[model samples]
Target: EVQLVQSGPEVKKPGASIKVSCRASGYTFSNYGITWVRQAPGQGLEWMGWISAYNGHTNSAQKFQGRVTMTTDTSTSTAYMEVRSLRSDDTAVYYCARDRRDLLTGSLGDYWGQGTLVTVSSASTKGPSVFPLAPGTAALGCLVKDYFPEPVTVSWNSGALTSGVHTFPAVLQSSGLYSLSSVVTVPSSSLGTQTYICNVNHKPSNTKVDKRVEP
Candidate 1:
């Protein structure tokens, strides 16, 4: 059960600095290398850098050559990435991935951290825009958008039912906010009488949005 657990979300002003941590467990930390990847709000993935936990050697992508630093502490089984002079464009989710080096295949990303959201802003106020998806084929979907602080809990009818529900990861929107989608599937025979609800919980702002649908 190898795992990479990252630190929590961060809010910082432009020109500020931040250091995020990735703690490894269930394996010998120094045996493999650790890599850092970044995805700007609503953007694709970017390779930041990687460090050899065994020998302390480091390699960084050209784009991050001077903008970021990657290091590791074998004793603590942890990897760290520090970014100085942050900017609004730097607001993104940072991920730590395990790098396994092979004799012929080079490095492979075997495991990954959940992610650490870094928000670079001077001041901000935002919440999720929740909406219900059109009922279709005994299934209901919920769309949540434009949220901040990234921790959102989406459930169906306050947990009255649990099976046949699926929620996806929050995606960074181009607006520098986040969006997510959830779906609930029901038996075909019950679609006519069943009323389904999609509940979204945005804890940072104490906001809850619920949308209901019947097929």
Candidate 2:
């Protein structure tokens, strides 16, 4: 019944620094390891790294090796991480997880803290690029590049065509940008020439980008 509670959201300008905390309760704090994770808007999860609560030892992901630092206070059962020299890619949801294990065995996480959203804004962002993925099945992709401050929503459109349309989750790119994909299925009988559109709204700019396709 142990619980990991995370801090609140934060908005920072690029190059700013932030310190987020996670508090543990209902269990022995020193018994579990603490780790951090990041999820950019509309993207999947990325593991930042972990720290041993009982010891001062720490391990971080290659991407965050120098950008993030982790620490803990067993007296307060709280864990902390400070991210410095922030960038657009650093804007994400951070969560703390508890390594579920007995003292005799190793650790694996089964409990996680509520995510704390961190947004970074600045003059560093590139517009998205669109392309087609596969064919005959009617699929489209939009690569929202290097946007900042977190959050971008995607939409789909086709003239008079509906149903079997879906958008996959956005993916975080290595360059601190994002990429998303969508698909729509047209009935074989209705497979004649048609037009499809992809729409995106970058929350940071309130700007919209669209892509059209015909075949």
State candidate 2's TM-score. 0.57
**Cand. 2 Cα-lDDT:** 0.74
lDDT of each: 0.84, 0.74
Q: What is the lDDT for 92 in model 2?
A: 81
Which stretches of candidate 1 lie above 4 Å from their native place? 100-105, 122-147, 161-198, 206-215
TM-score of each: 0.67, 0.57
Deviation (Å) of 163 in candidate 2: 21
lDDT by residue for model 1 (116-213), tens? 98888755556688888766347778888888767789888889978988899887666767788898777777777767888888877789888886
* Candidate 2: tens digits of C-alpha lDDT, residues 1-215: 87899988777878999999999999888877898988976679898988888766788889889988999899999999999999967878899998733345566777899889897865454555556543435444444455643466666662344467666666566665666666677644444555567676775556777776455
lDDT of the structure predicted as candidate 1: 0.84
At residue 20, candidate 2 shows an lDDT of: 98
Best-fitting candidate, scored by lDDT:
1
